[PDB]
Short mmCIF file of C-alpha atoms in Angstrom, two decimals:
data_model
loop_
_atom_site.label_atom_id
_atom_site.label_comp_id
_atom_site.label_asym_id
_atom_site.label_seq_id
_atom_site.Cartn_x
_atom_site.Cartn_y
_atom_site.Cartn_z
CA UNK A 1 -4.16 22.08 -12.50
CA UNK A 2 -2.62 19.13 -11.44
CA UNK A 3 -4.41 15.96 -11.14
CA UNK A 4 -2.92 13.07 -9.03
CA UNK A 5 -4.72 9.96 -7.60
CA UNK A 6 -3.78 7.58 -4.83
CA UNK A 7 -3.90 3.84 -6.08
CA UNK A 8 -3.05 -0.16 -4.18
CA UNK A 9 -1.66 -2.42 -6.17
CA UNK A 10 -3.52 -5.35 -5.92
CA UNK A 11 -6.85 -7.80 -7.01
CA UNK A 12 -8.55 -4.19 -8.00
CA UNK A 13 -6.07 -3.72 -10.02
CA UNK A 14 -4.26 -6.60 -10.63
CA UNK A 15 -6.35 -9.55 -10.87
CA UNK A 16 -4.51 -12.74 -11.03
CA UNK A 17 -1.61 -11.00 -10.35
CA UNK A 18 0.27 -10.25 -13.35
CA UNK A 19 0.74 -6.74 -14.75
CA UNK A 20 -1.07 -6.81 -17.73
CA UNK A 21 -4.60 -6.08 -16.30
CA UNK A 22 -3.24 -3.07 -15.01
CA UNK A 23 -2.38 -1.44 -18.22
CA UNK A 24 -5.92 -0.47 -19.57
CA UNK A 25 -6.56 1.62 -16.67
CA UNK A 26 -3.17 2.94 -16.02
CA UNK A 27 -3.40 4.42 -19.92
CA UNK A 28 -6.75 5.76 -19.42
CA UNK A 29 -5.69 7.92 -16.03
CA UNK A 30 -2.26 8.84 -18.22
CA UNK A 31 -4.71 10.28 -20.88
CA UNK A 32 -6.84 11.69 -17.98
CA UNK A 33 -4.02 13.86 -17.08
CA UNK A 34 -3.36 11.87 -13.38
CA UNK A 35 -0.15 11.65 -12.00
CA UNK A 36 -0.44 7.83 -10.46
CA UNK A 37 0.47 7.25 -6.63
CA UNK A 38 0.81 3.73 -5.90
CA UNK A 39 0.43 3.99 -2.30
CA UNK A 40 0.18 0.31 -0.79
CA UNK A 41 0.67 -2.25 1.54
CA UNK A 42 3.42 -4.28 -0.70
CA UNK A 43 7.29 -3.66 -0.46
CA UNK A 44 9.27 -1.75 -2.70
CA UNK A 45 10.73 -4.85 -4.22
CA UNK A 46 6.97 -5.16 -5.33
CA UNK A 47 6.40 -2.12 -6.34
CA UNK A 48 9.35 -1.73 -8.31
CA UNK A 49 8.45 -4.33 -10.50
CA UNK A 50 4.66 -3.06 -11.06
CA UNK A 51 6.14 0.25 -12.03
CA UNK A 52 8.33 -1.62 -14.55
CA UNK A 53 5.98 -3.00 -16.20
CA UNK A 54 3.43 -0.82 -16.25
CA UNK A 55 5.64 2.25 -16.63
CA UNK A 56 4.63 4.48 -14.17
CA UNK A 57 7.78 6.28 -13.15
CA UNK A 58 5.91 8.94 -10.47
CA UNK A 59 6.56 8.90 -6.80
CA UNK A 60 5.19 5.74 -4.82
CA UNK A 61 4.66 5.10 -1.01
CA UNK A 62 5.08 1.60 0.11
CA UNK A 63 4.02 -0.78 3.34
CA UNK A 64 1.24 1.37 4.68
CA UNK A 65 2.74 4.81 4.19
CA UNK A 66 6.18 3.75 6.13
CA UNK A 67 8.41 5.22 3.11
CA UNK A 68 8.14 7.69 0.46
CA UNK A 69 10.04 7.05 -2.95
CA UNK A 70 10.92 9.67 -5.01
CA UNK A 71 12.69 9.47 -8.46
CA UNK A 72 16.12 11.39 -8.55
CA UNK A 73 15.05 14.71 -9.86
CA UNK A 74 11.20 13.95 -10.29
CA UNK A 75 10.17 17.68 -8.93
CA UNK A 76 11.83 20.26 -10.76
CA UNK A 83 17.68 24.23 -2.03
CA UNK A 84 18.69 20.99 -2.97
CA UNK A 85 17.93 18.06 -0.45
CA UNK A 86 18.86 15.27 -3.00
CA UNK A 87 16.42 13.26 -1.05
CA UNK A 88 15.07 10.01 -2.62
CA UNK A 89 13.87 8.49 0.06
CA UNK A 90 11.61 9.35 3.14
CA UNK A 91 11.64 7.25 6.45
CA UNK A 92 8.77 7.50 8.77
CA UNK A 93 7.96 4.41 9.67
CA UNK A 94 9.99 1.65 11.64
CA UNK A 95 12.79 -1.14 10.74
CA UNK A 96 10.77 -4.42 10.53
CA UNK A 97 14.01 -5.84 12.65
CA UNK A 98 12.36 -4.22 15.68
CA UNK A 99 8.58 -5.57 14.55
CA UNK A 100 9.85 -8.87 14.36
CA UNK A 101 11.72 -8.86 17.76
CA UNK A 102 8.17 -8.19 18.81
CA UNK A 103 6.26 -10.74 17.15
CA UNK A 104 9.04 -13.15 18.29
CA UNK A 105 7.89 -12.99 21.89
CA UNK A 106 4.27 -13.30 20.90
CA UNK A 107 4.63 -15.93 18.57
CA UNK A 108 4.42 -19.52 20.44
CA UNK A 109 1.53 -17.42 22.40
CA UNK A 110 -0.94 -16.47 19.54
CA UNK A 111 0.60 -19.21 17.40
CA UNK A 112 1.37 -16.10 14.56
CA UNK A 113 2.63 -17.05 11.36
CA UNK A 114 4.38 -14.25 9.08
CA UNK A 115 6.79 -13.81 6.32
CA UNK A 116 10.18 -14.08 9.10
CA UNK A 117 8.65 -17.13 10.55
CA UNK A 118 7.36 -19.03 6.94
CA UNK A 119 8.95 -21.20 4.48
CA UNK A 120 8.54 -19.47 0.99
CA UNK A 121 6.14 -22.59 0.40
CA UNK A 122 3.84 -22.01 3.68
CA UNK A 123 3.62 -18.32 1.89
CA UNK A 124 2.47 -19.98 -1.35
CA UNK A 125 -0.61 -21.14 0.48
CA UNK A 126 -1.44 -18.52 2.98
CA UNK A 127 -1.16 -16.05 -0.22
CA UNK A 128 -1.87 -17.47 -3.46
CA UNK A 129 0.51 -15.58 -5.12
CA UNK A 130 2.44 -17.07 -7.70
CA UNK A 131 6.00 -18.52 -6.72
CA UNK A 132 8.38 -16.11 -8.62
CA UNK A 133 6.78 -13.58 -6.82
CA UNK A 134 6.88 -14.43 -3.42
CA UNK A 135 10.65 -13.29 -2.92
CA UNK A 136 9.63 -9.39 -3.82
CA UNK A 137 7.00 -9.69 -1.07
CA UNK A 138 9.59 -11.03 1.15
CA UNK A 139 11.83 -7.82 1.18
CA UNK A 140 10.23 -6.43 3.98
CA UNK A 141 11.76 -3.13 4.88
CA UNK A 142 9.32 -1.82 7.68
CA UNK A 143 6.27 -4.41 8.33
CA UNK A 144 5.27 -7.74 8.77
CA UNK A 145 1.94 -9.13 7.39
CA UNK A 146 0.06 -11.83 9.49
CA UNK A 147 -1.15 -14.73 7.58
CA UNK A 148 -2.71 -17.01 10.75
CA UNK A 149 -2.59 -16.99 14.26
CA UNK A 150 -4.28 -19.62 16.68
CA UNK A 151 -5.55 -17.48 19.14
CA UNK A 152 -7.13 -13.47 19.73
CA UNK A 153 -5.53 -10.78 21.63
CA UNK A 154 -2.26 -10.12 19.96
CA UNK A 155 -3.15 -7.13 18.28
CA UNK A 156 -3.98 -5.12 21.34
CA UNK A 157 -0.64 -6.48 22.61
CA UNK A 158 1.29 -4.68 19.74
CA UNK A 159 -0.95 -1.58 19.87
CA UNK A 160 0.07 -1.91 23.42
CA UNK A 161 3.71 -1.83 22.18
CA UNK A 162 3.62 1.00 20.50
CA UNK A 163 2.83 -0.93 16.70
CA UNK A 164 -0.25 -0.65 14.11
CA UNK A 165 -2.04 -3.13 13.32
CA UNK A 166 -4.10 -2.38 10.45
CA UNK A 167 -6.58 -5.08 8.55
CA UNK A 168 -6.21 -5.18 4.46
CA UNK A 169 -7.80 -6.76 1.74
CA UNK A 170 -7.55 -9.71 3.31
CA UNK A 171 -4.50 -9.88 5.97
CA UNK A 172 -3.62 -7.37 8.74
CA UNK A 173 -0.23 -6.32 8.62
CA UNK A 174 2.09 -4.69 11.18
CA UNK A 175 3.41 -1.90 11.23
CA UNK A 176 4.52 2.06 13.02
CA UNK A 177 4.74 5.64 13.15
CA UNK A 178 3.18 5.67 10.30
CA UNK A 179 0.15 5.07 7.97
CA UNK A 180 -1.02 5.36 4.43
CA UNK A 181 -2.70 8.84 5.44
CA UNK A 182 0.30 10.43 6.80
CA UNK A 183 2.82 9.62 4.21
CA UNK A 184 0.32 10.50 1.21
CA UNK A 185 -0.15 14.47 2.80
CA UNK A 186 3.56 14.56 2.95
CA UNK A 187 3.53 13.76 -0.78
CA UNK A 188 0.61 15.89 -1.51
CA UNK A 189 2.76 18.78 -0.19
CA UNK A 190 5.62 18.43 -2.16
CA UNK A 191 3.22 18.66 -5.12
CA UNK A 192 1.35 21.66 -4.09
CA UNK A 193 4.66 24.14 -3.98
CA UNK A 194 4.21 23.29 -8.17
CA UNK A 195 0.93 24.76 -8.28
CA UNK A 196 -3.11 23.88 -7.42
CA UNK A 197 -3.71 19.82 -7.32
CA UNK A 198 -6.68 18.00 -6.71
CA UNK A 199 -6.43 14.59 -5.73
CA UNK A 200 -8.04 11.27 -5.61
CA UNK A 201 -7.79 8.14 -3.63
CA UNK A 202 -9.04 5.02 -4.46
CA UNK A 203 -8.87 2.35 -1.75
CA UNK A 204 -10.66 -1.74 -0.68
CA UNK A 205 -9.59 -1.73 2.82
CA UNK A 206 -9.36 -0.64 6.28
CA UNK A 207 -5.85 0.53 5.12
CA UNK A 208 -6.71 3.42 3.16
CA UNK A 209 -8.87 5.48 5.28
CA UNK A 210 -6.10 6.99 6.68
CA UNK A 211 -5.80 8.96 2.79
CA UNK A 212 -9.97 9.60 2.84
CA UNK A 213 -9.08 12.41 5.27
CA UNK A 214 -6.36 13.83 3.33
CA UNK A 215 -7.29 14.40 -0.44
CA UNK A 216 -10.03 16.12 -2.31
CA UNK A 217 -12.31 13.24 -3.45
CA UNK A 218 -12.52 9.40 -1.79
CA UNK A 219 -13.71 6.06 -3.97
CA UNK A 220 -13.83 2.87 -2.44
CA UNK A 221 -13.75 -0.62 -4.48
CA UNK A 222 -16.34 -2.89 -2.49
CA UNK A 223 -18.59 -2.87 0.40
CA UNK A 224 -16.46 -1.06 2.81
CA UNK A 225 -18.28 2.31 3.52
CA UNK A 226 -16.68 5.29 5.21
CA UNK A 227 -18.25 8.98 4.83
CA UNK A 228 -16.14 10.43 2.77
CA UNK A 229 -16.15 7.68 0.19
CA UNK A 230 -18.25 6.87 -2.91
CA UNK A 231 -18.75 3.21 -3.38
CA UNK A 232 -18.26 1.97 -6.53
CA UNK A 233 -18.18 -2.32 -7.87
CA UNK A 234 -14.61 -1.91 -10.28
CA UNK A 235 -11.83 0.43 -10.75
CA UNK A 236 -13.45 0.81 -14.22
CA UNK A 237 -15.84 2.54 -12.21
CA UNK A 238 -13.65 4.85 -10.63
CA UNK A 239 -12.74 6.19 -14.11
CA UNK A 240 -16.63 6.17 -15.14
CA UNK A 241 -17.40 8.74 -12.36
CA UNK A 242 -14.44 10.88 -12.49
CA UNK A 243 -15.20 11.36 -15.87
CA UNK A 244 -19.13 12.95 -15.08
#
């Protein structure tokens, strides 16, 4: 029976973001018997690092479910595929946001100094180039007037609200790309799988695995609302 649980990578689990914070929990699902999914918002530049760190070495699915990752040989024809594509370039979401942005005065990573993402963010300095690599989204930090996001649903784009900032992307969502995953596991055997998610992001997954916990407020149907990710553990464990 394998176990595997959808997790982000951020302030739920990362608070203040270094690594560190992280391990505790990330030690606790490896004794659990979970095979951790980071599926999140952040670039694989980001991600990468995390991993590092933390060593996690399983498949991960970055910038809302627009790429799958999976480590040379990780399930045992051959497609010698590492990587899965379903979302779009962020060349194309920026020659979008280019026409709209002296309209809704938008600010984003393509249009910001690395210091004007300092302050939008918060995050700390050496960090800001891994959130930078943007392979298929753009994340808006301000804009001076409504209406833009209709005009990129309009267009063809998501728009979908995080944490804290919506970001941009298409084709694609966390949802999509996670069931894709969740299939590849499945030809191993029975799984059962988890998803823990703080934002509008992740309710694309709720629909898509066995059992749904959300970290906050947000409520959704499917979802049991819990205060921490030490939580999470705490009710899995019942």
């Amino acid at each position: 029976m394998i176990r595997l649980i959808f997790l982000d990578i951020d302030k739920t689990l990362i608070p203040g973001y270094e690594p560190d914070p992280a391990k505790p929990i990330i030690e606790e699902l490896k004794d659990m018997g979970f095979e951790i999914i980071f599926n999140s918002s952040k670039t694989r530049a980001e991600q990468e690092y995390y991993r590092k760190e933390l060593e996690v070495e399983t498949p991960f699915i970055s910038e809302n479910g627009s790429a799958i990752f999976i480590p040379k040989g990780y399930f045992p024809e051959v497609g010698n595929y590492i990587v899965i594509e379903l979302g779009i370039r962020v060349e194309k979401i920026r020659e979008e946001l280019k026409k709209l942005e002296n309209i809704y005065g938008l600010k984003y990573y393509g249009n910001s100094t690395k210091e004007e993402i300092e302050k939008f963010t918060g995050m700390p300095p050496e960090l800001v180039p891994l959130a930078m690599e943007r392979e298929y989204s753009e994340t808006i930090f301000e804009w001076s007037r409504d209406g833009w996001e209709e005009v990129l649903v309009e267009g063809g784009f998501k728009v979908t609200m995080g944490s804290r900032f919506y970001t941009v992307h298409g084709n694609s969502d966390k949802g999509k790309a996670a069931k894709i995953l969740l299939d590849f596991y499945k030809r191993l055997g029975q799984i059962e799988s988890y998803a823990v998610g703080d934002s509008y992001n992740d309710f694309p997954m709720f629909e898509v695995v066995d059992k749904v916990f959300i970290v906050g407020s947000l409520k959704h149907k499917k979802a049991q609302n819990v205060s921490s990710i030490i939580d999470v553990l705490e009710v899995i464990k019942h």
